[PDB]
Amino acid sequence: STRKAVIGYYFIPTNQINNYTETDTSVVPFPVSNITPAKAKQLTHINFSFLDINSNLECAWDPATNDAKARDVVNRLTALKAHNPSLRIMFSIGGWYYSNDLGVSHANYVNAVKTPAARTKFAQSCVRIMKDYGFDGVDIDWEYPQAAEVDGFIAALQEIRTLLNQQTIADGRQALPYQLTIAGAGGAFFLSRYYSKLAQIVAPLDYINLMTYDLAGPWEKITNHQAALFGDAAGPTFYNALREANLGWSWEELTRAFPSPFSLTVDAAVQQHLMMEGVPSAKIVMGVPFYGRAFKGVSGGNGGQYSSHSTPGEDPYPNADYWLVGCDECVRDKDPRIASYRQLEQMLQGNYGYQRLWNDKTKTPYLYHAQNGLFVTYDDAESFKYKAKYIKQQQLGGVMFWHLGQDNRNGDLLAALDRYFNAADYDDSQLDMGTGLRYTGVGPGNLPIMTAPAYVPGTTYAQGALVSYQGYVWQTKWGYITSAPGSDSAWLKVGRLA
Numbered sequence: 001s002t003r004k005a006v007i008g009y010y011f012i013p014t015n016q017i018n019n020y021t022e023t024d025t026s027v028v029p030f031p032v033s034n035i036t037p038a039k040a041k042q043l044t045h046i047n048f049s050f051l052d053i054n055s056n057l058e059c060a061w062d063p064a065t066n067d068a069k070a071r072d073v074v075n076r077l078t079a080l081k082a083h084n085p086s087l088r089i090m091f092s093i094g095g096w097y098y099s100n101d102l103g104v105s106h107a108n109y110v111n112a113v114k115t116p117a118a119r120t121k122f123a124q125s126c127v128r129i130m131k132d133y134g135f136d137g138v139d140i141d142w143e144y145p146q147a148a149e150v151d152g153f154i155a156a157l158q159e160i161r162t163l164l165n166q167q168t169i170a171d172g173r174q175a176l177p178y179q180l181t182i183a184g185a186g187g188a189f190f191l192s193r194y195y196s197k198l199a200q201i202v203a204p205l206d207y208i209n210l211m212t213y214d215l216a217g218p219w220e221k222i223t224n225h226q227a228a229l230f231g232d233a234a235g236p237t238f239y240n241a242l243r244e245a246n247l248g249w250s251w252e253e254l255t256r257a258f259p260s261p262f263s264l265t266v267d268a269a270v271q272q273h274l275m276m277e278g279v280p281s282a283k284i285v286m287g288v289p290f291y292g293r294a295f296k297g298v299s300g301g302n303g304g305q306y307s308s309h310s311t312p313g314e315d316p317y318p319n320a321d322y323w324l325v326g327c328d329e330c331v332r333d334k335d336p337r338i339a340s341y342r343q344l345e346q347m348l349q350g351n352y353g354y355q356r357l358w359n360d361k362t363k364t365p366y367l368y369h370a371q372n373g374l375f376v377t378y379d380d381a382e383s384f385k386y387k388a389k390y391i392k393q394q395q396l397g398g399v400m401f402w403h404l405g406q407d408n409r410n411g412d413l414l415a416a417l418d419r420y421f422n423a424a425d426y427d428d429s430q431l432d433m434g435t436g437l438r439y440t441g442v443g444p445g446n447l448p449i450m451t452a453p454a455y456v457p458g459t460t461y462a463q464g465a466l467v468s469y470q471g472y473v474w475q476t477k478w479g480y481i482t483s484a485p486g487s488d489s490a491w492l493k494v495g496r497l498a
């Protein structure tokens, strides 16, 4: 009965703020007024993006921002709360461009969290910005802290949380308390930077919004779905970096939690979070893309999937060949590698030579252009059925998406998500989740309920034997064991009673 979060990013670049208008699409293509009252009601959160951390190690607007015009844009968002008393307008600090390891502001992230005094100054700036502009909470999208930064980052989230709670009391906002989220890694390689401390990262948050998209891109050897729900045995597999994290676990505990190689999927990332003790399913939000990733130079045979390709990975895009046939936004943005769902529907509708195909393992669509050798991986209202059902079945907090400006004009992706969670007449009880590969790791946070005979002192247990003892089901790792389960290294806790 607790409503699923539906968290949509609203991104607007500094030049568009500084020239804001709602009546000229060539200047601002996605003004706040495209978020109509019906869209407002279907959202729980809008994440306004992006703010940054400056060299004074405070949360700050891009210094080229016209402040009066910024306030105006933010005021138009917050006015939407008139249509939906559950709605929050968050603001987001970071993003890939500012905060990636080679990003323009990267050192400011590292330095802002590094010491107690820096964290106090930074935390205060976040809450000051939030109050000054009328936002409802803070989202941190640092992609990604690593190493010694992680203890600092945790401390900074803890301090923000305390300051938000103070502000909730001050404003009497107990009915809509100020919130703290992060955009979390959605793939094991980046997740491995802070994985061992995941319960400490999540504790101060209302949600961790997993970036379970961009799981494929031009940096990969072969094409792949960027947001596959489940795995396809014909697709690529990857090393499970989490088995090397500083967890202190045994070989058997590692091996049971972290199969390798593994399929890089939404389900993988969600299960990886659930495995960890102290990470509640209700805080885990599944991110979904409202854009496709395009590849060129692909071979025939399986619809462009799992092919070698010739897509440049350099930034900026290195030439003026805008080879994504039918994508006008790509010409405008000078980059054929990403296209909004909005644009993709038009490409598919026009006579551009794409077929829309469906992978019934991954439960995702893809475009194939057989003549030119193009492949596009994206999500639609159909893949959203399976993802919504998964969110309900796994008792997740909800869905996040990047970004609102990429939905079609009628807002059909957002409407679909809202329907699958909230429509009285939508029924997915019979929706078949398929036989794609499930991530089968088990860790301390997601032990299955099991039964077994009670342990008996004196009995010699062979390898593989299962007993119940003190709340759990235990399995011997070798034989013959007579020790009490948990008293030495021979027993593996495999299950929980009752």
Ligand SMILES: C#CCO[C@@H]1[C@@H](C)[C@H](OC(=O)NCCCNC(=N)NC(=O)NC)[C@@H](C)C(=O)O[C@H](CC)[C@@](C)(O)[C@@H]2OC(C)(C)O[C@H]([C@@H]2C)[C@H](C)C[C@@]1(C)O
Pocket (backbone or CB within 6 Å): 009, 011, 013, 050, 095, 096, 097, 098, 141, 143, 183, 211, 214, 333, 334, 335, 338, 402
């Ligand atoms: C989030 C994110 C990715 O960041 C994209 C920005 C880095 C764009 O990256 C993507 O959209 N990638 C797909 C989404 C990946 N998502 C994330 N990593 N993180 C995320 O979703 N966080 C919630 C790329 C494709 C892009 O547009 O770069 C532009 C050239 C085409 C930039 C780099 O010039 C870009 O131009 C504009 C469009 C004005 O955006 C600027 C930045 C200056 C911001 C700062 C960067 C973003 C928001 O467009």
Ligand SMILES: C#CCO[C@@H]1[C@@H](C)[C@H](OC(=O)NCCCNC(=N)NC(=O)NC)[C@@H](C)C(=O)O[C@H](CC)[C@@](C)(O)[C@@H]2OC(C)(C)O[C@H]([C@@H]2C)[C@H](C)C[C@@]1(C)O
Pocket (backbone or CB within 6 Å): 100, 101, 102, 187, 189, 190, 214, 215, 216, 218, 219, 220, 221, 238, 264, 313
């Ligand atoms: C192709 C290639 C190899 O290049 C990798 C760099 C391109 C890496 O390429 C590979 O290692 N390729 C395949 C092997 C492993 N595959 C994955 N790790 N897949 C995965 O994480 N999927 C989400 C991938 C994993 C990567 O990290 O890409 C990043 C976005 C996800 C980049 C492209 O944004 C990357 O981010 C950082 C981490 C800041 O590194 C940057 C560059 C900006 C350098 C310039 C690129 C390299 C050196 O990290």
Ligand SMILES: O=[P-]([O-])[O-]
Pocket (backbone or CB within 6 Å): 322, 323, 324, 325, 326, 327, 328, 330, 331
């Ligand atoms: O790049 P185009 O065929 O709009």
Ligand code: NA
Pocket (backbone or CB within 6 Å): 350, 351, 352, 353, 354
């Ligand atoms: Na056609």
